[PDB]
Amino acid sequence: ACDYTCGSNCYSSSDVSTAQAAGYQLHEDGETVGSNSYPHKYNNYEGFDFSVSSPYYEWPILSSGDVYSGGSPGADRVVFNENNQLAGVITHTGASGNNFVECT
Known part of the structure; x- marks a missing residue:
């Protein structure tokens, strides 16, 4: 009963929107954090079927909440x-090299 299951990690829609709120503000503020500068452009090399429109930004969600x-970043x-x-x-988790897979 995880809202989203990433490997052995379990996230609720509430955990996800809390992470999204912090990442979007950084985006809106035009700021970033960490050596790899998150949040940043997510191009969708994987070709996932996102229902919302481009552009996309990737922001880390931590298993520790x-x-x-x-x-x-994890x-x-x-x-x-x-x-x-x-x-x-x-x-x-579950993807090869630097690829991603969607959390079920």
Whole structure:
């Protein structure tokens, strides 16, 4: 009964919207955090079928429930668009190399 299951990680829609709110504000503020500068453009190399419109931005969602603030990003991400609409929750867990797969 996870709202989203990323490997052995379990996220609720509430966890996802809390992560999305912090990431979108950073986006809107035109700021970033961490060595890899999150949030940033998510191009959809995977060709996932997102229902919302481009552009997409990837922001880390942490299994610890704390909001990402610059450290190790982990394998899971929340992808939201320019309008602050959730596109999907994805993960490196189960995918090869740097690819992603959608969290069920």
